[PDB]
Amino acid sequence: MPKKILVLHTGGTISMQVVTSSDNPMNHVSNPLEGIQVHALDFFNLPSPHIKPKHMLVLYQKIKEEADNYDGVVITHGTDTLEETAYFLDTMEVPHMPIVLTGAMRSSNELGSDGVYNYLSALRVASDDRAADKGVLVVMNDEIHAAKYVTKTHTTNVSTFQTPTHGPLGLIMKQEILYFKTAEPRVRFDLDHIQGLVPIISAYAGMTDELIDMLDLEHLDGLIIQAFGAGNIPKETAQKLESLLQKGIPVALVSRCFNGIAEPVYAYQGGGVQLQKAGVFFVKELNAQKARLKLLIALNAGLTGQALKDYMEG
Template structure:
């Protein structure tokens, strides 16, 4: 169970002590068994796969957009609303840190993509437009890298929804047909963490693709 605080201990309304108490109660409960890694904050607990920080300062910052929270801590009671379905346990000997994350913007060139590949990146995660689209230069370079063996994964800049290869003519369908892996509704940072673990396990390209697509939903 991961915890934290939005307000420091010397502020008028520190939230850290309550988050610690709630997290201990959650971790010690029978209800928590089998739920996997979680974040407990503001009397709610969320699956690590689904949760994201949505606000810079509010105490109710952690939400799970598409899937919803797992449950609540109501005083000394743990209230479970659902169990996570998309879960995996990995026994990795280590992680591979050489995984880069590139957020696409209007008119972005392939400069950063080429730089990452030329400087030892084992994998590259792209945060693309909408359903997983890119600029022409990014598409061309991403496909070329994927065909040479670099793992390239597409996620979305959007906070909600899933990537899906739909559009041709340089869009997501072109990327997918060129070997780029589409990561469902995983965010860019989460796809990067997953890749770091999977590469550390030494999975072949087929197994790696399977795991990403499975956990992407």
């Protein structure tokens, strides 16, 4: 019997330096590969820089609604923010089935002779039952990545994605899909609404308190700081963060380093030990845009107090 895959296209076509990108008709046919039957929807028509958490929730709801009608799900998504939507879905209580995101190819080739290789690869992975227990997956360029760790690294004609340090969860071979490990199950929430302001700022040599002093603390629900190294910031910045922390505003830091792991060790002012004592959350191995969603989801799910700290730092 064929595998039945639900395909949710979110990216439409876009204006590029000026022409409109081409939509390969293979993205919409019901039988793109032997043994794979597709139900493809033009679900959104959004450049990925325009994707918001409200769209991510609607994708989640669609997957829950259709879970019993398909073998797996493929979402095509502009590559600029694909990793953010992937991480979001991987933090939701998604059904136990293959769920794969892949890039919306932005092409001016009108005949489609550049192909839909990554989409076809995603259908293969979504049709393999070994993917059901691997979490939400990102498939690009014959590699299968865990949503929690994948990031876009190259801005070439077709984007490149990587998992820092650990490499891909799996590889697409000629006649097999090879998986290297099963990642640890994640803490997940059945969220139905997202609201709140949680921005991202980056530390730098010479930072003091001038930017933080500009924040309107009555409207700020949280803050992500991309800190130096294992999690350090300048002395004046750390002193100013007290006005946020003592107002009850959660502040979470990530390492600005590509392979960085956040670890409070230094005890001078602005050192990670002093920041953690003051109440800053150390997010151990996650980039800033995903830590921002982790905090936003945690606040909207109902975590407060010790449980919010323990979840963010877990």
